[PDB]
Structure 1
Amino acid sequence: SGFRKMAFPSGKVEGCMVQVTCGTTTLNGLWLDDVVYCPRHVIPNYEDLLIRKSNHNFLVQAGNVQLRVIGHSMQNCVLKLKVDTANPKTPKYKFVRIQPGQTFSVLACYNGSPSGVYQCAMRPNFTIKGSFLNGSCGSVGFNIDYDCVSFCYMHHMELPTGVHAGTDLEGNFYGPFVDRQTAQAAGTDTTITVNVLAWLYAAVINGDRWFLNRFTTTLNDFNLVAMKYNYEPLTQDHVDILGPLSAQTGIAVLDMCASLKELLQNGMNGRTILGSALLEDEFTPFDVVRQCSGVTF
Structure 2
Amino acid sequence: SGKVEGCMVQVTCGTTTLNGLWLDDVVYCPRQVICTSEDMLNPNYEDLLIRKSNHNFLVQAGNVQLRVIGHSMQNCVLKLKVDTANPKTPKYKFVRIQPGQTFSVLACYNGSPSGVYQCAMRPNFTIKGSFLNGSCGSVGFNIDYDCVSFCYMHHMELPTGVHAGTDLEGNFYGP
Give the TM-score normalised by the residue count of structure 2. Answer: 0.90
Contact 2:92 2:150 (8 Å CA) reproduced:
yes
What is the CA–CA distance in structure 2 between the aligned matches of 1:71 and 1:131, rounded to whole Å?
Answer: 35
Contact 1:20 1:112 (8 Å CA) reproduced:
no
What is the CA–CA distance in structure 2 between the aligned matches of 1:173 and 1:67, rounded to whole Å?
Answer: 27
Contact 1:27 1:110 (8 Å CA) reproduced:
no
Give the TM-score normalised by the residue count of structure 1. Answer: 0.54
Deviation string 1:250-281 (CA, Å, 9 cap, x unpaired) is xxxxxxxxxxxxxxxxxxxxxxxxxxxxxxxx
Unaligned runs of 5+ in 2: 35-42
Contact 1:18 1:111 (8 Å CA) reproduced:
no
Aligned match of 1:165: 164
Cα distance, 1:12 vs structure 2: 1.4
Cα distance, 1:139 vs structure 2: 0.3
Is the alpha carbon distance of 1:26 and 1:48 closer, same or farther for their aligned partners in structure 2, counting shifts above 3 Å? same
Cα distance, 1:110 vs structure 2: 2.6
3-state SS in 1 of match to 2:85 = coil
3-state SS in 1 of match to 2:3 = helix
3-state SS in 1 of match to 2:134 = coil
Cα distance, 1:130 vs structure 2: 2.0
What is the CA–CA distance in structure 2 between the aligned matches of 1:169 and 1:68, rounded to whole Å?
Answer: 22
Is the alpha carbon distance of 1:118 and 1:31 closer, same or farther for their aligned partners in structure 2, counting shifts above 3 Å? same
User: Taking CA–CA contacts closer than 8 Å with sequence separation of 6 or more, which of the two structures ends up with the larger relative contact order?
Assistant: 2
Contact 1:26 1:135 (8 Å CA) reproduced:
no
Contact 1:106 1:141 (8 Å CA) reproduced:
yes
What is the CA–CA distance in structure 1 between the aligned matches of 2:84 and 2:134, rounded to whole Å?
Answer: 25
Deviation string 1:13-52 (CA, Å, 9 cap, x unpaired) is 1011111110100110100000000000000011110111
Cα distance, 1:112 vs structure 2: 2.4
What is the CA–CA distance in structure 1 between the aligned matches of 2:2 and 2:151, rounded to whole Å?
Answer: 16
Q: Which moved more, 1:127-136 or 1:92-101?
A: 127-136
Deviation string 1:34-92 (CA, Å, 9 cap, x unpaired) is 00000000000111101111111111111110000001111111001110101111100
Greater C-alpha Rg? 1
What is the CA–CA distance in structure 2 between the aligned matches of 1:85 and 1:39, rounded to whole Å?
Answer: 20
Answer yes or no: is 1:37 the counterpart of 2:28. Answer: yes
Name the one with the larger strand percent.
2
3-state SS in 2 of match to 1:97 = coil
Identical columns (%): 99
Is the alpha carbon distance of 1:34 and 1:135 closer, same or farther for their aligned partners in structure 2, counting shifts above 3 Å? farther
CA RMSD of aligned residues (A): 1.2
Contact 2:13 2:56 (8 Å CA) reproduced:
yes
3-state SS in 1 of match to 2:168 = coil
3-state SS in 2 of match to 1:28 = strand
Deviation string 1:207-244 (CA, Å, 9 cap, x unpaired) is xxxxxxxxxxxxxxxxxxxxxxxxxxxxxxxxxxxxxx
